[model samples]
Target: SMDLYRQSLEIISRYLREQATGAKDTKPMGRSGATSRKALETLRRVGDGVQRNHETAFQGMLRKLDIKNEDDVKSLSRVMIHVFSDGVTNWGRIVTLISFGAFVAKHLKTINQESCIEPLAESITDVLVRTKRDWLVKQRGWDGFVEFFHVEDLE
Candidate 1:
């Protein structure tokens, strides 16, 4: 079932919508996604942190890295591979990768190259699922993401 990949797409889509509207997406993440409030907050925080911290760096990376053409997905695939090649595949790292993927999707949208988003999502999915399948399986996949970052308060 490509649940993880599908969830990645949904999150990315929400990112695009939020960016375009200059506001937060208040809708539910979907019936099949983000089961708990803490899980949702975890995703939100990771995404917001990326925007606040890594977006300009990513923009610089994209300025040199070409991903406009359909075939250019390979460039991003390779980039994402290197991003994960550090070898310590933790949830924070995993979610950061996904958040970066969403940022790339937003970049594509900004340039009117929206068609590349799904392929980019697939590339990201391959990097995580292929390289980290055993580890994700060990942690019980997305359930582990929820439990690992489950916070109790807004504090």
Candidate 2:
């Protein structure tokens, strides 16, 4: 009896709402339908928020590391890319750390054979932790960002 009654109410409510909002459904614009349009808009806003947050955090990290100037950013990006690419092979973590150490040793005057390893390690860890914290907060603020984007599913 409960199931039958529930089914009847659902069908009747669906028909009534559809009839009431049929042609004059001002909630949605364009031809794609209201739900679809709303979903797209929500996704767009979420993406924009996440992208902006990521860039802001990245720039902040660079600034904190005293990597001023576009050339410095570009150089670090190139080094990171190469380190990651080569790191994916054997002994990834150690190799990546070594590559990063080498880069810092070359560019940073404060870094050298004696103090290079620890400072580079601390800097890298700080950057990663900051980025992760920023990303988590951003995603939490815009819940859709984490829910919508699946890294493994992306092409």
Candidate 3:
């Protein structure tokens, strides 16, 4: 099932959504409230696992982040705003990434879509070496993202 190829739709939709309105709603709020809101939205969109995408690459990892506990929705809202500014080089963007990842894990757990998430885990070895997917279970499934990607703070 190459249904995982529907990632483009989700990403595109989010991009357009942010363009029409202020990016704040979907733009990574630097852990302040950015990831929290976007995480919930992503959860709702892909909750069914029936959406469109060109993203089957991470299909296996989706189950792990599809968490179903809305209770923590508020918690996702409570992240850091880079308060320290210690110049530790930490990115608030990580907060959004982790938040979305958690939401995906939680959602999949609820639907029982991915009985064994390890399959996807096998593919993301290089992708998880950093602090990003390091927050995940097996550290697999976090593919296609990198420092070379687009800038986050910029509108």
Candidate 1 local lDDT, 4-112, one digit each (tens): 6566456555554554446766777754664534454667776678766887777777787766776776677777787688677788787777677667677777778
Instruction: Please estimate how well model 3 matches the true structure, expressed as its whole-model Cα lDDT.
Output: 0.33
Tens digits of per-residue lDDT, candidate 2, 78-124, equal 45544443523222232233333333433443332333333444444
TM-score of each: 0.73, 0.21, 0.23
Return the lDDT, model 2, position 50.
42
In terms of lDDT, model 1 sits at 0.68
Can you write out model 3's per-residue Cα lDDT over 1-155, one digit (the tens) per residue? 12122232233234333323334242443222433344435533443233223235345534433334444332322222222222333223333333334334435345563432222222221222232333332321112222213256567
Q: Report lDDT per candidate.
A: 0.68, 0.37, 0.33
Task: Indicate the TM-score of model 1.
Answer: 0.73
Better of 1 and 3 by lDDT: 1
Q: How would you order the candidates by TM-score, starting with the best? A: 1, 3, 2
Best by TM-score: 1
Candidate 1 residue spans exceeding 4 A from truth: 1-41, 153-155
Better of 2 and 3 by TM-score: 3
lDDT ranking from best candidate downward: 1, 2, 3
What C-alpha RMSD separates each model from the true structure?
Answer: 3.6, 22.5, 15.6
Alpha-carbon shift of residue 29 in model 3 (angstroms): 30
